[PDB]
Design an enzyme around this catalytic site. Sequence first.
Site, PDB file in Angstrom:
ATOM      1  N   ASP A 180       0.846  -1.174   0.000  1.00  0.00           N
ATOM      2  CA  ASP A 180       0.000   0.000   0.000  1.00  0.00           C
ATOM      3  C   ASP A 180       0.892   1.237   0.000  1.00  0.00           C
ATOM      4  OD1 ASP A 180       0.454  -1.164   2.663  1.00  0.00           O
ATOM      5  OD2 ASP A 180      -0.865   0.401   3.464  1.00  0.00           O
ATOM      6  N   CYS A 214      -8.055  -2.754  -4.346  1.00  0.00           N
ATOM      7  CA  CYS A 214      -6.893  -2.822  -3.469  1.00  0.00           C
ATOM      8  C   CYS A 214      -7.524  -2.586  -2.106  1.00  0.00           C
ATOM      9  CB  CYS A 214      -5.831  -1.770  -3.823  1.00  0.00           C
ATOM     10  SG  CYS A 214      -6.401  -0.115  -4.306  1.00  0.00           S
ATOM     11  N   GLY A 217      -9.168   1.251  -2.875  1.00  0.00           N
ATOM     12  CA  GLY A 217      -9.701   1.208  -4.225  1.00  0.00           C
ATOM     13  C   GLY A 217      -9.342   2.453  -5.022  1.00  0.00           C
ATOM     14  N   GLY A 219      -5.385   3.930  -4.842  1.00  0.00           N
ATOM     15  CA  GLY A 219      -3.960   3.996  -5.129  1.00  0.00           C
ATOM     16  C   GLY A 219      -3.478   3.001  -6.153  1.00  0.00           C
ATOM     17  N   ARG A 220      -3.358   1.762  -5.715  1.00  0.00           N
ATOM     18  CA  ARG A 220      -2.928   0.689  -6.580  1.00  0.00           C
ATOM     19  C   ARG A 220      -3.939   0.464  -7.683  1.00  0.00           C
ATOM     20  NH1 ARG A 220      -1.868  -2.717  -1.333  1.00  0.00           N
ATOM     21  NH2 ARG A 220      -3.415  -1.173  -0.658  1.00  0.00           N
ATOM     22  N   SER A 221      -5.226   0.549  -7.353  1.00  0.00           N
ATOM     23  CA  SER A 221      -6.274   0.380  -8.352  1.00  0.00           C
ATOM     24  C   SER A 221      -6.124   1.432  -9.439  1.00  0.00           C
ATOM     25  CB  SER A 221      -7.659   0.506  -7.727  1.00  0.00           C
ATOM     26  OG  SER A 221      -7.945  -0.572  -6.857  1.00  0.00           O
ATOM     27  N   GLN A 261      -2.075   7.420  -5.444  1.00  0.00           N
ATOM     28  CA  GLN A 261      -1.851   8.034  -4.156  1.00  0.00           C
ATOM     29  C   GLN A 261      -0.471   8.546  -3.849  1.00  0.00           C
ATOM     30  OE1 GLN A 261      -4.229   8.375  -1.096  1.00  0.00           O
ATOM     31  NE2 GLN A 261      -5.072   8.971  -3.084  1.00  0.00           N
TER      32      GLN A 261
HETATM   33  N1  LIG Z   1      -9.164   5.978   9.139  1.00  0.00           N
HETATM   34  C1  LIG Z   1      -9.608   6.537   7.879  1.00  0.00           C
HETATM   35  O1  LIG Z   1     -10.665   6.180   7.384  1.00  0.00           O
HETATM   36  C2  LIG Z   1      -8.748   7.596   7.230  1.00  0.00           C
HETATM   37  C3  LIG Z   1      -9.512   8.937   7.292  1.00  0.00           C
HETATM   38  C4  LIG Z   1      -8.605  10.127   6.943  1.00  0.00           C
HETATM   39  C5  LIG Z   1      -9.401  11.394   7.034  1.00  0.00           C
HETATM   40  O2  LIG Z   1     -10.559  11.426   7.448  1.00  0.00           O
HETATM   41  O3  LIG Z   1      -8.759  12.492   6.644  1.00  0.00           O
HETATM   42  N2  LIG Z   1      -8.283   7.322   5.862  1.00  0.00           N
HETATM   43  C6  LIG Z   1      -7.518   6.082   5.710  1.00  0.00           C
HETATM   44  O4  LIG Z   1      -7.284   5.343   6.657  1.00  0.00           O
HETATM   45  C7  LIG Z   1      -6.984   5.675   4.345  1.00  0.00           C
HETATM   46  C8  LIG Z   1      -7.186   6.485   3.202  1.00  0.00           C
HETATM   47  C9  LIG Z   1      -6.663   6.088   1.947  1.00  0.00           C
HETATM   48  C10 LIG Z   1      -5.947   4.878   1.833  1.00  0.00           C
HETATM   49  C11 LIG Z   1      -5.392   4.465   0.598  1.00  0.00           C
HETATM   50  C12 LIG Z   1      -4.668   3.254   0.525  1.00  0.00           C
HETATM   51  C13 LIG Z   1      -3.978   2.803  -0.765  1.00  0.00           C
HETATM   52  F1  LIG Z   1      -3.592   3.884  -1.446  1.00  0.00           F
HETATM   53  F2  LIG Z   1      -2.888   2.078  -0.423  1.00  0.00           F
HETATM   54  P1  LIG Z   1      -5.002   1.832  -1.871  1.00  0.00           P
HETATM   55  O5  LIG Z   1      -4.179   1.466  -3.042  1.00  0.00           O
HETATM   56  O6  LIG Z   1      -5.487   0.523  -1.116  1.00  0.00           O
HETATM   57  O7  LIG Z   1      -6.258   2.695  -2.316  1.00  0.00           O
HETATM   58  C14 LIG Z   1      -4.518   2.460   1.676  1.00  0.00           C
HETATM   59  C15 LIG Z   1      -5.065   2.860   2.895  1.00  0.00           C
HETATM   60  C16 LIG Z   1      -5.767   4.068   2.978  1.00  0.00           C
HETATM   61  C17 LIG Z   1      -6.281   4.472   4.221  1.00  0.00           C
END
Ligand SMILES: NC(=O)[C@H](CCC(=O)O)NC(=O)c1ccc2cc(C(F)(F)P(=O)(O)O)ccc2c1
Length: 297
Positions: A180, A214, A217, A219-221, A261
């Site tokens: 991630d 991912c 859904g 970054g990697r996606s 991301q």
């Molecule tokens: N606890 C939460 O929900 C917070 C909230 C942040 C906020 O309110 O500003 N956001 C996250 O934890 C959060 C946000 C984007 C992510 C994006 C990825 C990723 F980029 F790796 P992906 O490829 O899985 O999309 C992984 C984890 C990720 C976690």
Amino acid sequence: EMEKEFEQIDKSGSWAAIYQDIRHEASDFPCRVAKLPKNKNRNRYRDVSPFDHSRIKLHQEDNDYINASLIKMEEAQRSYILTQGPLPNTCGHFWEMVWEQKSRGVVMLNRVMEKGSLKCAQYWPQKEEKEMIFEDTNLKLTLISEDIKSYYTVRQLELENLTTQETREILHFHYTTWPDFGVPESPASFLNFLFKVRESGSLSPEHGPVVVHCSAGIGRSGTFCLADTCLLLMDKRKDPSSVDIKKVLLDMRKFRMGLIQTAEQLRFSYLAVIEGAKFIMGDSSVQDQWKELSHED
Ligand SMILES: NC(=O)[C@H](CCC(=O)O)NC(=O)c1ccc2cc(C(F)(F)P(=O)(O)O)ccc2c1
């Protein structure tokens, strides 16, 4: 000109700037349905929601919500459904979505256990003798076969609508080494994975959009879809020199927020597309160069 721009940005070390300029230009549409109090537990992350205009709707009456978006690339002529990693309570919705949208392949780019937490629910059976049933959506999922490689596993699943007793084959492409906020091992590894997905027929227009996911859904996606879309465009446009990766990413973000991301993931997309361009402009005869470089075994 793609390759020129890449060198230009690399030399001056402007990847973060280029990336951030994209974020600051990114579209912004409401996600009203995603924020309704009844959908709170259907969202993995608070800051990652599907725009109302492009969200995938479940054909359920009481609640049609699922955190998924239809990325509809008009020029490239390819749709992808980007969605978050299913939650313990949304696995039935996930497969329901797969059923209703008529998807034939599912692309998983994350791991169920990343670092130390549920980055995704185990939504498919691990043993063929232990099928999974989602009682809420009346669906049955059985593992038919598995083909494990070094950095990715391809699976054959049989999804059955228990109401209709209709059965379908779903191909599951799981990239197991994409961290991630990280990047693939190399353009070769990623491209070797992308092409296997292309070759399966999962992306054909005769099937529903491939479902890509991912953890969030995005970054990697997003990296996966950006590369695939740009490659499609270079295979279609009079001159691949005109394909602007930055513009492509911007049209994608009109369908789902946060695609790509990290600045490094944008840079990698440039790399993957440039390398993939080689095996689209005739030199496809040595595609096995990627299979060897990716190690795979
Ligand atoms: N606890 C939460 O929900 C917070 C909230 C942040 C906020 O309110 O500003 N956001 C996250 O934890 C959060 C946000 C984007 C992510 C994006 C990825 C990723 F980029 F790796 P992906 O490829 O899985 O999309 C992984 C984890 C990720 C976690």
